[PDB]
Amino acid sequence: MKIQTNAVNVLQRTSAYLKSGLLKETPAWYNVVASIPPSTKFTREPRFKNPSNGHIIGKLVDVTEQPHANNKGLYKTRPNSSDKRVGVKRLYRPPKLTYVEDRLRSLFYKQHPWELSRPKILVENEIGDENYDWSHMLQIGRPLDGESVIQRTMYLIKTKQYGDMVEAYDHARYEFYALRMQEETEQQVALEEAEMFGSLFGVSAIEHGIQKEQEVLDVWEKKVVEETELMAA
């Protein structure tokens, strides 16, 4: 798609019309568009930092900047093949955003498959309003999950209570587990209490599941009989 001249040069085209006398009366938008000009500078702008990491895009490590011996003990005395190629496309193509937390997230759900079954609302509430002190896991607006663990790990890393990342992660995991156990106990005892004081639940979860299975089975059975009849004939 070519860069369209005629979408942004509107006021100029109308100003010409007004000058001529093709237009007797000025549009409502004319003064407003004059006051607030369009961009009209549709450039490819280069980028020098990856925002997520903070790696430098533009720079090249020199031969003089690498004085000491390489892996396999060879001193770099020349530019290599890649150091001669003009790496301009890297300045312009947008950076792949990388986070240390993504790896931790991946690890957590590998270690805890059934944490995936806990449903996750992705529809954000005000991201600016929140204010979580990751001294502890249990934040108010946020629920208990692998995310909270990971945030705790990051906090530990920052504060240097656990200098190592792995140890901090383990600690966060152990904090999580206790909380989860407590949550589990809460629900069961609440259920027990309800049973004791004459509460009545019409459909339990397992009963519901059985009912759901039953309809499917009924559907299958009629179909299966028809299929057997077809096979016979």
Residues 49-78 that bind other proteins (CB under 8 A): 50-52
Which one, 63 or 224, has the nearer CB to other proteins? 224
| Interface residue with other proteins, options 13, 55, 136, 158 (CB under 8 A) | 13
Report the site for other proteins in 89-108 (rule: CB under 8 A).
92, 94-97, 99, 101-102, 105-108
| Interface residue with other proteins, options 14, 149, 152, 153 (CB under 8 A) | 14
Angstrom CA distances, 121 to 76, 125, 202, stand at 53, 10, 28
169: nearest Cα among 140, 177, 115? 177
Asked if residue 48 binds other proteins (CB under 8 A), the reply is no
Provide, rounded to whole angstroms, the least separation between the CB of residue 58 and other proteins.
16
Provide, rounded to whole angstroms, the least separation between the CB of residue 9 and other proteins.
9
Contact 120, 109 (CB under 8 A): no
For the range 98-102, what are the long-range contacts, defined as Cβ-Cβ under 8 Å and sequence gap of 24 or more?
98/50, 98/52, 98/53, 99/52, 100/154, 100/165, 101/150, 101/154
# binding residues, other proteins (CB under 8 A): 129
x/- track of binding to other proteins for residues 114-153 (CB under 8 A): xxxxxxxxxxxxxxxxx-------x-xxxxxxxx------
Q: Which amino acid is at 181?
A: M
178: nearest Cα among 150, 139, 149? 149
Tokens of 111: 């270690």
State residue 56 phi and psi, 5-degree precision.
-90, 135
Q: Indicate the DSSP class of residue 130.
A: -
Of 27-35, 64-72, 79-87, 155-163, the segment contacting other proteins by CB under 8 A is: 27-35
Which one, 13 or 83, has the nearer CB to other proteins? 13
Which one, 53 or 66, has the nearer CB to other proteins? 53
Rounded to 5 degrees, what angle do the CA atoms 143, 147, 149 make? 95
| Interface residue with other proteins, options 72, 85, 203, 229 (CB under 8 A) | 203
